[PDB]
Design a protein around this nucleic acid. Structure first.
Ligand SMILES: [Mg+2]
Lengths: 64, 135, 56, 189
RNA sequence: CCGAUAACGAACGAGACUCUGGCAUGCUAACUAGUUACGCGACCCCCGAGCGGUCGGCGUCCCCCAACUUCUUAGAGGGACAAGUGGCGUUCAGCCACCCGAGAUUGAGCAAUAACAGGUCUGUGAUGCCCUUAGAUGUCCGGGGCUGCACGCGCGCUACACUGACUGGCUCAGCGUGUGCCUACCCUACGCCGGCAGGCGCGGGUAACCCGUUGAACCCCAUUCGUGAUGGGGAUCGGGGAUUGCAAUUAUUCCCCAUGAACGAGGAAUUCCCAGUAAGUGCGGGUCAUAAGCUUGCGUUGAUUAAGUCCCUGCCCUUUGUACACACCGCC
């Protein structure tokens, strides 16, 4: 029933966020489906072309 | 980052390019050597900053008309402007599109009924003027 | 810097004079301003004539 | 052909998850005899990912002021702890360290200071580089806390910390802290 | 800085500049610097090497009786410019990445207009006024004080331990000081005595010549200890011995043997910091007859995190509002 942990690869970096620069928003496409892609805010040093894991499918989508 | 060149180097580079464009070239290590004798530069750092900007500006000049003057580009302009005069004028067209409203004006000036004039059909609809405001 | 003693107190005088540049070094210094770039003026040296060869 | 500390070839180690393959540096050109190759790894962003992971462990293990420049002692400690983990498990200490890092690196966290909503504020994902950094930091902190006021040696406590993290037994300080962080991130979703 | 332009032409500041660090087996040189090579040696191997291995042992500017400058020293120069390539950008100013390269942001110094009732009259034979000027607020001498303690605060040092302490062995620096105008007081090798602090003789050095090849600490390798207020910590305190000085009591400092107190990582708060940096760790200089828990420098080991933001604290520019202009610690 619960959604399994999946993987998403960063394609683009959408700039910092978090009121202190401590997060960066990145557009990530799921390794399962190349077409399906969302935007998520992540912490730590991120560069385009790296894979990060997701414990949930949807959390957030906004443009600053 | 932090590689902005100031007035002291930019004006000097422009002046020496204007004066010695022929001697100057695309080689940084040769422009730094010609800068030894074409001008008195107190500091080696100043002289090679100037030489680097000179090479950059010459790369720009070889393609386009930079604000720094050059006698070859100036004479090329002075050629293009006074030349490419067409063998036949664009003002000796055999037929001329003339609106009937414009036709009556020549009648008073008794220069109408010329062969080169062709009385057209004026547009009907008066559909000029853009729609007002938004949309 | 010089002090002047007046009946009311002390007046401090500071005088700074920017010396003029001169290659002789007597009326002032010899080195030019570090940011001053002086460009020598060339001659014409156009030579648009036909290629000849002087024999000497 | 390299044999870090004279033994335990590096080429036999396989990285488990794709997310940390580019950031865990154990194989091929990341094959050095010693975890002491000071080479200006902080001069640019994303350069410590090219630093071999044993050297990162060594750098993180010397902390709390009392031993800050003593990197030779830390190299010795890592060498011994590798001997103990090989003795206990029978498998490659480098593989054990890699698996411990994979299992210790948290996958989510919390951030934002918006009046401290529920636990911190709003849940956030973590980058692979921060996963590796936090895993190494958690392992070193767990070993240090385990070996502070007791007879067990730093090498032994580092060994058992890495072993428990690699097997995921939740008997490790790093695993417990990671679980707590994931729990509060879930609450701050 | 590029550009737009009722502005044009300038001046200061920034930058440029000076010193320092990084590279030059390229040049100039070196008995107050060395390296190689050779000759004497000393020790090991000797089966058998022998152009064998070690020598901070002696020599070859003790002038005819070797060369060279890599190491060291320091001068002249060179070298790096966003210069080359790719992308972004008006394709402008520039930005990002990469190659080659020692180096693609090394640190400092200097530093505008205007101002503060900021600090110094206890730096000055800088100084206006005022006070005192012989029972002196001048100056000198003796003694005491500046240290004094129910308490609060700031800069620090040592620690709370086993990533440790003790004992022994081994092993590596760079800054820089050194015999005094007055002015008396230097750095110290070596030998002897003592357990130590020290003492007693002999030198050397006014200095790349002597200390000194600065045998530094940490670190490294072995020993003991075993999670305890314990061999952690060394506060407090007794007794004894030296050194400086005219004088050591309110202990100047140092040495030895005893005492082993709090302290088991510290609340609210809060400081500093981005690469040879923080930190650990010693060594110089200043003060110094005697002296560093201070400061100014130097080396040694040497990281975690970050290449962002305006959230807090502030700063700069523009617009805006103002009843403020002693300028929001305002005004009312
Ligand atoms: Mg003891």
């Amino acid at each position: 029933r619960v959604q399994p942990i999946k993987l998403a690869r960063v394609t683009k970096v959408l700039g910092r966020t978090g009121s202190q620069g401590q997060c960066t928003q990145v557009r990530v496409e799921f390794m399962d489906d190349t077409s399906r892609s969302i935007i998520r805010n992540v912490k730590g040093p991120v560069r385009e072309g790296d894979v990060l894991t997701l414990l949930e499918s949807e959390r957030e989508a906004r443009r600053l | 980052m932090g590689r902005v060149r100031t007035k002291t180097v930019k004006k000097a580079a422009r002046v020496i390019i204007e004066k010695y464009y022929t001697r100057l070239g695309n080689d940084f290590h040769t422009n730094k050597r010609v800068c030894e004798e074409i001008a008195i530069i107190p500091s080696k750092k100043l002289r090679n900053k100037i030489a680097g900007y000179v090479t950059h500006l010459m790369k720009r000049i070889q393609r386009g008309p930079v604000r720094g003057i050059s006698i070859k580009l100036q004479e090329e302009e002075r050629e293009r402007r006074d030349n490419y005069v067409p063998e036949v004028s664009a003002l000796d067209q055999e037929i001329i599109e003339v609106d009937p409203d414009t036709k009556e004006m020549l009648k008073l000036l008794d220069f109408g009924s010329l062969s080169n004039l062709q009385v057209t059909q004026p547009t009907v609809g008066m559909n000029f003027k853009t729609p007002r405001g938004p949309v | 810097v010089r002090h002047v003693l007046l009946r009311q107190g002390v007046l401090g005088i500071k005088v700074k004079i920017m010396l003029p540049w001169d290659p002789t070094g007597k009326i002032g210094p010899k080195k030019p301003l570090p940011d001053h770039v002086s460009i020598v003026e060339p001659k014409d040296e156009i030579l648009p004539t036909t290629p000849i060869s002087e024999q000497k | 052909d390299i044999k870090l500390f004279g033994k335990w070839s590096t080429d036999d180690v396989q990285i488990n998850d794709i997310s940390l393959q580019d950031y865990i540096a154990v194989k091929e050109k990341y094959a050095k005899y010693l975890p002491h190759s000071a080479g200006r790894y902080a001069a640019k962003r994303f350069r410590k990912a090219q630093c071999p992971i044993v050297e990162r462990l060594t750098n993180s293990m010397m902390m709390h002021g009392r031993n800050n420049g003593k990197k030779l002692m830390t190299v010795r400690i890592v060498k011994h702890a590798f001997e103990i983990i090989h003795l206990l498990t029978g498998e490659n200490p480098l593989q054990v360290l890699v698996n411990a890092i994979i299992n210790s690196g948290p996958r989510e966290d919390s951030t934002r200071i918006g009046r401290a909503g529920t636990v911190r504020r709003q849940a956030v994902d973590v980058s692979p580089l921060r996963r590796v950094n936090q895993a190494i930091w958690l392992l070193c902190t767990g070993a240090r806390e385990a070996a502070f006021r007791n007879i067990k040696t730093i090498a032994e406590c580092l060994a058992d910390e890495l072993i428990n993290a690699a097997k995921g037994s939740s008997n490790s300080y790093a695993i417990k802290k990671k679980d707590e962080l994931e729990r509060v991130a879930k609450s701050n979703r």
